[PDB]
Amino acid sequence: TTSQKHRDFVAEPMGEKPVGSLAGIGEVLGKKLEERGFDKAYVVLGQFLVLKKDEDLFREWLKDTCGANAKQSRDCFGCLREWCDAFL
């Protein structure tokens, strides 16, 4: 259902977690995202909120911004959406 990384990210507010803290976002993808400018997880979330929490927008943008497959982009969107439901 959910990755343990996803559950850990969901359980608490993100605060200042790096983009690598996102579920399905490891060293390589998180590093690529930081190179693209979204150096922080909350920057990526602001992008996600600007996309009006859209799954397709966020996942396709993530895929074209770091190279994540459907799995990693889907996990990242799910993590962001569930965190938004929990705290936002």
Binding site: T2, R7, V10, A11, P13, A86, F87
Partner: peptide, 9 residues
């Protein structure tokens, strides 16, 4: 437990 627990204090 099928219940994800989300807390803020």
């Amino acid at each position: 437990s099928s219940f994800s627990q989300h807390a803020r204090t």
